[PDB]
Design a protein around this ligand. Structure first.
Ligand code: CLA
Ligand code: CLA
Ligand code: CLA
Ligand code: CLA
Ligand code: CLA
Ligand code: CLA
Ligand code: CLA
Ligand code: CLA
Ligand code: CLA
Ligand SMILES: CC1=C(/C=C/C(C)=C/C=C/C(C)=C/C=C/C=C(C)/C=C/C=C(C)/C=C/C2=C(C)CCCC2(C)C)C(C)(C)CCC1
Ligand code: SF4
Lengths: 11, 90, 146, 742, 74, 80, 141, 30, 74
């Protein structure tokens, strides 16, 4: 679930 | 199939009393005589109006004034001791 | 000229219910009345002024008389900060027992209305201390209205 | 007879028409002289009946528009599935559904809006969703993300296919008119093909995929260890261990000893204790029965063969006591005009949506749906709003048909003429019943308030002073409670727990369902519902019936369907068109739906939902004050609007701030609508005159002269803004309250 | 806090004055109807022609300005 | 009864006569224009004030004007 | 032209409706429209519904002049039929209403008087202050 | 004293009834 | 104090509206264009457009910026 949230904050 | 004529306009525009009856009076003659005798004073219009207004006013005022405190809560008056206001006011 | 709007024939001719509405609406519009002239308009204005003055004087007389009769001015002037002013009494056949109990405020023996108009302070400042003064003022204003 | 008839290349795909706007209508196509032209170009965009007169072009345009709409719907579904697959916490929610809030939207970190990423749970931050999609996916058997990705890709492909089909059918092969007017084949295919085969296939999926995976999930196994769905198909041993009946294969079904399939096709009914939903076996059985029934019923109409029935024969040959000849020319009317079909279909769809909402809140069909209060509230409110809007639109289209598609010479109907010939009696009786119902229903509340304010609580219409109990509803509840023992020998329990009697069902410490009592408040609220419904019906029916002609205006048909007025004469004749009647009925529909949703929300929060303890007592959300505080208007204003708005307004600085922002914005829009609703055109035109002078003084005047909006446009803008503001206010309030406390 | 409220009060005063002044000055006539003085101070409308003319009299300007007066005083 | 007045700016296009729903207006010969005719309103007592005549009149400002006045049964359009 | 009469004309075939005459017909007045139809055909009544008009002379009763004129103009536009309507009082007086000169008003005919003609532009009217305190009106002059 | 018990019904009911009757008669009178 | 302030302010608002209403009535009825040629009243009737435009500009400015500041703070 962490990766899905991190997908928005990649930049 | 003619529904208009000028000689008599009663049936042309429809001046009919649909539920009017012309039978003689079926009431008992003695009953009618008694009721006619005892209903005479109320026939006049202005006198009936004046009597109705004056009598109604007088009766309503008398009933309101004479009535005791059991029927009317407002005529009983307060019973519990008074309480003070928010900031100590009376 | 025949129906209720005697001041306008056009409003009296039509048979619908708008005659009543428009007769009530345009009663004070003295310019549109039929057969009107300048003199009549001015005199009607003068009479209306006099009637209005009478109404105002009657209103203030009624206020003074009710405060004098059903109020607590004498108890208020002694302790201004700890007494609630009373406007007039309440009589109501529809009131229940809890309503009578709850509305009894001040030093009265029945329901009253607390006055938020502020006439108590004004009358206290201008130099009135007893109910006789208020009764006298009520009579004087009645005479002025008459 | 029945055949395929097409025309090759009726129109050629070219960019030349895109260059110039308003090609459908000549007066639009001429060119813009004032700004009004612009406002017209959107008003007649989809008025296919007025662009031309031939039925073939209208039918082809309708077909193409339907294809485009289907493509848009498929794209929306694909987007929802992809969001579920990529930015979501579905896998976390799968293991621990009770303590994790669903969320499938993540906000960027641009300005300071990152505070919108609330902590729903399961190591995730995002906006909580209330669409109920997670329950759908769990009930479908989906236990991973690759499956969701595949579903999204399939949805995108289907959207592309629908778009291509629409283009092909409008520009390459356009069906002819006789193809459209073959309603027997259409009905046969829509009943036997669309509704029978689809439900049979879904029953197949539920029997083959959903049931074993859901059994494994309910057994307590971890989601990552459950075998893949195709392994159940390939391996007979796993199915045999799970269900011994499958060991016999398809032999019993062909042998008519179907009792062997009683393991996974049952008739128990009620709610499943583990998840608080309907048994999946019952749902599969119901789908199979529905498939059989629809396949049987889809072979009724005669098409291209000897057998069947004729719709025209059925309509003409029906002789009854009250009707008589009656239905004679209805076939031509219903096969010639699109508006009549649109009206009937809209009314049916609206009623169906309302029934769907009622049945869905009554019996939860998905696992872990009952205990989610926000999802239930959102679904109920949304579906009821949709149903109300559709029911309202039906009347407008009926009025359109009556105005522009009705002639008594070529096509004559006896029943329609009989209805038209005595409209005054209908309207008078409807008006009387509306007045009486409203007077009593609202006078009860006013009397309660007045007796309360005077300190006379013993003269109310309440549960203690004067009682008005709904005896018929209580009798029906008792009969339904006693039915399973005697009236329904097959059913083991009641159809739903809402009926009085039985046992409370709760899941994970939260109440799922219990019997709902009925008292004086329910009586009063139901009568208010009836009053509002009757008034709306009166408005719409009057608008439809008096569309062609009236006593005031004997030639209202020539003026048309959309004309603001006839003039200042006759005392004033504003808002006589049927369009104005629809515009007036929208407000009353809004009123009725608002009252109904308020009633549902308060009753559910007061007497059903709540929490349960280990000992056994139940504590409801609001303490069960609906039965005594809802009989006065002060009670509705204080205990409901004032008390339940604390969470909406005190959400600033938290993860629910957007709800408060929308709460204020909806108020602003609602206040804005009155500007258009109350004023008139002449003042605005005269103001624009001075503004235009000020512009022309500086040589900046445009060629398209500004013009104030027409009367009908002003009314439409006003009603649109009013409805949007009210609905948004209710949405924000409901969602904030039920997310915070639920 | 008082700055914004004072500016809101000024906005209300300006808008009410605009409505009333427009109604007073455009009473004798305008371009949409250059003979407004013949019909009188108060009249319903002038029919649906010329695009439709509702609330065109000065009485309607006063009736519109009353709302803004109430809002500003509130 | 209302008041319908015809001014001399008229050009005799016969539109106002056709537009009237109660048969109030008519046309008479004239010599002040090219069409050699003008409008007239004999049956004024039948006018209902619908102002349809003013809607169909091509002129910088209308050559036919309707002023509302005292109302009556005929002008109000009551059927009872 | 000499006004005609309507002695004994029959009536179209109808089943009855609630949009017919009312107390005003017995009290104040009503209107009678007469025409001539070459064939028995179905038309639509102003009150509501559909009726059938017979061949020959046809006569109908209505409550207002607008209904008569609307039916007549529909007959003229769609069926190409001439028509004429009168007004009838409770006293039996009959007043000829439609074309008084025997010609429809849309066509000019000599012998017609001018009524309510102002020989000035609409912008030459005097201000209301000029006519104040008198019964006359600015547009009346 | 009890003046309100006598005066309130008069102003509340009897006088408005007389006023309404007189005004209706004068309105409808020809 | 609160009641007196509110009462007097509402009365003042109503009276101020009535002033403009009666000014418009005067312009409709009692104005004689010939006897007031080229005085201040005629010059006022001459250039209504500038006054209306500037009032509209001021109201638009105030409303736009006050609402913007309030919404930004919110
Ligand atoms: C809308 C309905 C409504 C109803 C039903 C009631 C009912 C009641 N009110 Mg409330 N009230 C209402 C609205 C209503 N109120 C409103 C709007 C207000 C204003 C705030 C009040 C304020 C109020 C007050 C101040 C008081 C009451 C009280 C009462 C009681 C007195 C009733 C009475 O004596 O007259 C009944 C009179 C009749 C002549 C009945 C006529 C109706 C008959 C039955 C018609 C039946 C028709 C027939 C069957 C039709 C077919 C005919 C065919 C057979 C030929 C009663 C329980 C009084 C009380 O305290 O009671 C406890 C009281 O003091 N009410
Ligand atoms: C403005 C002053 C006013 C006054 C003084 C009253 C006074 C009263 N109201 Mg009324 N009322 C008013 C306005 C007023 N009302 C208005 C505006 C409304 C509309 C909301 C009502 C609606 C209303 C209701 C709904 C009810 C009353 C009732 C009552 C009575 C309650 C006392 C009691 O406890 O019952 C004691 C018991 C009684 C039944 C008294 C019986 C004697 C009566 C007064 C008749 C005397 C007869 C007399 C000849 C009347 C004819 C004279 C004519 C000129 C009026 C009392 C007479 C109650 C009532 O009387 O029920 C019928 C009641 O239920 N009122
Ligand atoms: C000026 C306004 C005024 C007002 C608003 C009131 C108001 C009131 N009076 Mg008071 N009163 C007034 C002046 C006024 N009074 C005067 C001048 C007197 C001396 C005669 C009284 C003596 C008085 C008594 C003895 C009683 C009341 C009571 C009441 C209360 C019940 C109403 C009623 O029964 O009327 C009663 C009214 C009268 C018998 C006569 C007053 C009428 C005067 C002569 C003229 C009013 C004219 C009015 C302005 C109409 C103008 C029309 C114009 C608009 C076109 C109510 C609070 C009653 C109460 O105590 O209840 C709790 C009651 O018992 N009043
Ligand atoms: C059906 C409607 C639909 C809707 C309303 C949304 C809505 C959204 N999408 Mg999704 N999406 C959809 C379908 C939909 N999507 C489909 C069908 C696909 C597959 C192609 C995607 C694939 C997708 C991706 C890959 C991303 C989003 C993201 C977003 C968000 C930002 C969009 C943006 O700012 O544009 C940008 C503006 C222009 C391109 C110009 C927004 C919530 C973004 C996200 O939320 O990131 C955190 C993002 O990265 N979407
Ligand atoms: C058994 C075959 C069949 C099927 C399945 C359908 C099904 C449908 N028709 Mg009907 N129809 C049929 C026969 C059939 N029709 C015949 C013979 C006629 C002529 C009398 C019509 C006349 C007709 C019209 C005039 C319209 C429809 C429409 C619809 C659609 C309604 C939307 C919906 O409910 O979503 C349900 C969702 C889905 C099932 C979509 C999935 C895609 C399906 C499965 C495609 C396969 C269906 C197709 C018939 C077969 C392909 C043919 C081609 C490859 C040779 C739906 C696709 C309406 C529509 O939406 O317009 C396009 C419409 O306007 N139909
Ligand atoms: C089932 C589908 C359906 C269909 C196919 C139709 C079909 C038709 N309608 Mg019907 N109608 C329906 C349902 C439907 N209606 C419903 C539910 C209602 C009740 C409101 C109506 C009420 C109705 C009216 C009142 C009218 C029609 C008319 C029409 C015709 C013209 C369409 C038009 O020009 O719009 C072109 C497109 C627009 C003008 C779009 C307007 C923008 C909408 C209103 C805004 C919604 C706001 C949005 C959701 C908020 C987001 C905010 C964000 C954008 C900032 C068209 C044949 C018109 C007619 O004249 O028929 C001949 C007409 O007058 N319809
Ligand atoms: C100083 C005194 C004053 C005077 C002498 C006048 C004089 C005049 N006015 Mg002006 N006026 C004034 C102040 C004044 N006005 C104020 C303050 C305003 C602003 C509101 C106006 C606005 C105004 C308008 C808008 C109009 C006039 C017009 C008129 C003339 C007609 C009067 C008439 O017919 O009304 C008689 C009116 C009534 C009897 C009916 C209305 C009553 C109101 C609506 C009652 C409200 C209901 C009530 C409070 C309910 C209470 C319920 C309870 C529960 C509390 C008259 C020459 C009229 C005209 O056309 O002149 C040429 C015109 O239309 N005036
Ligand atoms: C609270 C709601 C409301 C609002 C906001 C307005 C607003 C306004 N009134 Mg109105 N009015 C209302 C109710 C309202 N009125 C009511 C109830 C009435 C009684 C009928 C009137 C009657 C009335 C009259 C008689 C007059 C006005 C005028 C005005 C304007 C005054 C100047 C000014 O304030 O500009 C400030 C501007 C704004 C606050 C407008 C909002 C700006 C938006 C939010 C910006 C767009 C942003 C965003 C991107 C939107 C995108 C939309 C989306 C689809 C993409 C202004 C447009 C006066 C006028 O026209 O002056 C020129 C005038 O003559 N009004
Ligand atoms: C109506 C007047 C108004 C005013 C004066 C302001 C004022 C301000 N806003 Mg607010 N705001 C408003 C309405 C208003 N707002 C509304 C209606 C909303 C709701 C949509 C917001 C929501 C809002 C947000 C969400 C934010 C602001 C922020 C800001 C600041 C912008 C700083 C910046 O971007 O500079 C940098 C950009 C430039 C200097 C622009 C000029 C350069 C141009 C492009 C040319 C370059 C080459 C030549 C500024 C103090 C921002 C902030 O951080 O404030 C503390 C911010 O985050 N505002
Ligand atoms: C600061 C100060 C000061 C000063 C002050 C001043 C200077 C003020 C002013 C003020 C002002 C300066 C005000 C004004 C106002 C105004 C108004 C309010 C107006 C109104 C108007 C109107 C309403 C009009 C009307 C009309 C019309 C419409 C038309 C014609 C007629 C008439 C005119 C009637 C001093 C030094 C003392 C010191 C202390 C402080
Ligand atoms: S207002 Fe109507 S009825 Fe009167 S003359 Fe003009 S068109 Fe005819």
């Amino acid at each position: 679930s962490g990766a899905n949230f991190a997908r928005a904050f990649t930049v | 199939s003619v529904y208009f004529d000028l000689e008599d306009l009663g049936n042309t525009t429809g001046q009919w009393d649909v539920y009017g009856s012309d039978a003689p009076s079926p009431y008992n003659p003695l009953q009618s005589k008694f009721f006619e005798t005892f209903a005479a004073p109320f026939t006049k219009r202005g006198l009936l109006l004046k009597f109705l207004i004056l009598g109604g006013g007088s009766l309503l005022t008398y009933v309101s004034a004479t009535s005791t405190g059991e029927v009317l809560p407002i005529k009983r008056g307060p019973q519990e001791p008074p309480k003070l206001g928010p900031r100590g006011k009376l | 000229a025949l129906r209720f709007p005697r001041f306008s024939q056009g409003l009296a001719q039509d048979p619908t219910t708008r005659r009543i509405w428009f007769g009530i609406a345009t009663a004070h519009d003295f310019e549109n009345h039929d057969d009107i002239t300048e003199e009549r308009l001015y005199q009607n204005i003068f009479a209306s002024h006099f009637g209005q003055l009478a109404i105002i004087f009657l209103w203030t007389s009624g206020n003074l008389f009710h405060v004098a009769w059903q109020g607590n001015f004498e108890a208020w002037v002694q302790d201004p900060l700890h007494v609630r002013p009373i406007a007039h009494a309440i009589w109501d056949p529809h009131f229940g027992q809890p309503a009578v109990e709850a509305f009894t405020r001040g030093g009265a023996l029945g329901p009253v209305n607390i006055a938020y108009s502020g006439v108590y302070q004004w009358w206290y400042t201008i130099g009135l201390r007893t109910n006789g003064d208020l009764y006298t003022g009520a009579l004087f204003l009645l005479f002025l209205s008459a | 007879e029945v055949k395929i008839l097409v025309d090759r290349d009726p129109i050629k795909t070219s960019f030349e028409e895109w260059a110039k706007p308003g090609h459908f209508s000549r007066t639009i196509a001429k060119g813009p002289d004032t700004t009004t032209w612009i406002w017209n170009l959107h008003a007649d965009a989809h008025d296919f009946d007025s662009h031309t007169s031939d039925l073939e072009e209208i039918s082809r345009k309708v077909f193409s528009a339907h294809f485009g709409q289907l493509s848009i719907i498929f794209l929306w579904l694909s987007g929802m599935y992809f969001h579920g697959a990529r930015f979501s916490n579905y896998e976390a929610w799968l293991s621990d559904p009770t303590h994790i809030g669903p969320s499938a939207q993540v906000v960027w970190s641009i300005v300071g809006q990152e505070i919108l990423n609330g902590d729903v749970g399961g190591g995730f931050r995002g906006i909580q969703i209330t669409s109920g999609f997670f329950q759908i996916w769990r009930a479908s058997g989906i236990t991973s993300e690759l499956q969701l990705y595949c579903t999204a890709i399939g949805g995108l492909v289907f959207a592309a296919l629908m778009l291509f089909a629409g283009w092909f059918h409008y520009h390459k092969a356009a069906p002819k008119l006789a193809w459209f007017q073959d309603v027997e084949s259409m009905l046969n295919h829509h009943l036997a093909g669309l509704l029978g085969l689809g439900s049979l296939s879904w029953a197949g999926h539920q029997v083959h995929v959903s049931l074993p995976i859901n059994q494994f999930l309910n057994a307590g196994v971890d989601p990552k260890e459950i075998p893949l769905p195709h392994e159940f198909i390939l391996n007979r041993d796993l199915l045999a261990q799970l269900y011994p009946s499958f060991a016999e294969g398809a032999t019993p079904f062909f042998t008519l000893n179907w009792s062997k399939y009683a393991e996974f096709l049952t008739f128990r009914g009620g709610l499943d204790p583990v998840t608080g939903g309907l048994w999946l076996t019952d749902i599969a059985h119901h789908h199979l029965a529905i498939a059989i029934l629809f396949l049987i019923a889809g072979h009724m109409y005669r098409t291209n063969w000897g057998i069947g029935h004729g719709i025209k024969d059925i309509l003409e040959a029906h002789k009854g006591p009250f009707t008589g000849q009656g239905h004679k020319g209805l076939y031509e009317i219903l096969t010639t005009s699109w508006h009549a079909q649109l009206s009937i279909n809209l009314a049916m769809l609206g009623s169906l949506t309302i029934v769907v909402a009622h049945h869905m809140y009554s019996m939860p069909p998905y696992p872990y749906l009952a205990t989610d209060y926000g999802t239930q509230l959102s679904l109920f409110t949304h579906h009821m709003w949709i149903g109300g809007f559709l029911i309202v639109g039906a009347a407008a289209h009926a009025a359109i048909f009556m105005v522009r598609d009705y002639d008594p010479t070529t096509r004559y109907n006896d029943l329609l003429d009989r209805v038209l010939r005595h409209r005054d009696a209908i309207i008078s009786h409807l008006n009387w019943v509306c007045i009486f119902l409203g007077f009593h229903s609202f006078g009860l509340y006013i009397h309660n308030d007045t007796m309360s304010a005077l300190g006379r609580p013993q003269d109310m219409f309440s549960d203690t002073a004067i009682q008005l109990q709904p005896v018929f509803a209580q009798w029906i509840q008792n009969t339904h409670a006693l039915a399973p023992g005697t009236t329904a020998p097959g059913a083991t329990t009641s159809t739903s727990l809402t009926w009085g009697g039985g046992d409370l069902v709760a899941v994970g410490g939260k109440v799922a369902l219990l019997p709902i009592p009925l008292g004086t408040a329910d009586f009063l609220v139901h009568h208010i519902h009836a009053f509002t419904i009757h008034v709306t019906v009166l408005i719409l029916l009057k608008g439809v019936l008096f569309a062609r002609s009236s006593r005031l205006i004997p030639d209202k048909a020539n003026l048309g369907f959309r004309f603001p007025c006839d003039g200042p004469g006759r005392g004033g004749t504003c808002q006589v068109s049927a369009w104005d009647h629809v515009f007036l009925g929208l407000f009353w529909m809004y009123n009725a739906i608002s009252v109904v949703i308020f009633h549902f929300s308060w009753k559910m929060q007061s007497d059903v939902w709540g929490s349960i303890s280990d000992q056994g007592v139940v504590t409801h959300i609001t303490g069960g004050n609906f039965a005594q505080s809802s009989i006065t208007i002060n009670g509705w204003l204080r205990d409901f609007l004032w008390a339940q708005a604390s969470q909406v307004i005190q959400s600033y600085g938290s993860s629910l701030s957007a709800y408060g922002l929308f709460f204020l914005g909806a108020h602003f829009v609602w206040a804005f609508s009155l500007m258009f609703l109350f004023s008139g055109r002449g003042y605005w035109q005269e103001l624009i005159e001075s503004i235009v002078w000020a512009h022309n003084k500086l040589k900046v005047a445009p060629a398209t002269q500004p013009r104030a909006l027409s009367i009908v446009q002003g009314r439409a803008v006003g009603v649109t803004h009013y409805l949007l503001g009210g609905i948004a206010t209710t949405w924000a309030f409901f969602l904030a309250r039920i997310i915070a406390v639920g | 806090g008082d700055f914004l409220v004072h500016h809101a009060i000024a906005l209300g005063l300006h808008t009410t004055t605009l409505i009333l002044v427009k109604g007073a000055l455009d009473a004798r006539g305008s371009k949409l109807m250059p003979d407004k003085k013949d019909f009188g101070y108060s009249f319903p409308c002038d029919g649906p022609g010329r695009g439709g003319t509702c609330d065109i009299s000065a009485w309607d300007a006063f009736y519109l300005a009353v709302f803004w007066m109430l809002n500003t005083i509130g | 009864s209302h008041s319908v007045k015809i001014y001399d700016t008229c050009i005799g296009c016969t539109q106002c006569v056709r537009a009237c729903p109660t048969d109030v207006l008519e046309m008479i010969p004239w010599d002040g224009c090219k069409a050699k005719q003008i409008a007239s309103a004999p049956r004024t007592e039948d006018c209902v004030g619908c102002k349809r005549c003013e809607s169909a009149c091509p002129t910088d400002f209308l050559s036919v004007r309707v002023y509302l006045w005292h109302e009556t049964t005929r002008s109000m359009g009551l059927a009872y | 032209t000499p006004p005609q009469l309507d002695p004994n004309t029959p009536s179209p075939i109808f089943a009855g409706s609630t949009g017919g005459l009312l107390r005003k017909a017995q009290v104040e007045e009503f209107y009678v429209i007469t025409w001539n139809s070459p064939k028995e055909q179905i038309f639509e009544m102003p009150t509501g519904g559909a009726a059938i008009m017979r061949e020959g002379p046809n006569l109908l009763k209505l409550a207002r002049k607008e209904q008569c004129l609307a039916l007549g103009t529909r007959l003229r536009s769609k069926y190409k039929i001439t028509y004429q309507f009168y007004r009838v009082f409770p006293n039996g007086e009959v007043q000829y209403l439609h074309p008084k000169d025997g010609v429809y008003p849309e066509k000019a005919n000599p012998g017609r008087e001018g009524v309510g003609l102002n020989m000035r532009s609409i912008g030459k009217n005097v201000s209301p202050i000029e006519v104040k305190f008198t019964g006359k009106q600015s547009y009346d002059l | 004293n009890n003046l309100p018990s006598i005066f309130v019904p008069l102003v509340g009911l009897v006088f408005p009834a007389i006023a309404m009757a007189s005004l209706f008669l004068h309105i409808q009178k020809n | 104090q609160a009641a007196l302030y509110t009462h007097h302010q509402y009365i003042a608002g109503f009276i101020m509206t009535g002033a403009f209403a009666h000014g418009a009535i005067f312009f409709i009825r009692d104005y004689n264009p010939e006897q007031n040629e080229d005085n201040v009243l005629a010059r006022m009737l001459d250039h209504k457009e500038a006054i209306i435009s500037h009032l509209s500009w001021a109201s638009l400015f105030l409303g736009f910026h006050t609402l913007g500041l309030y919404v930004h703070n919110d």
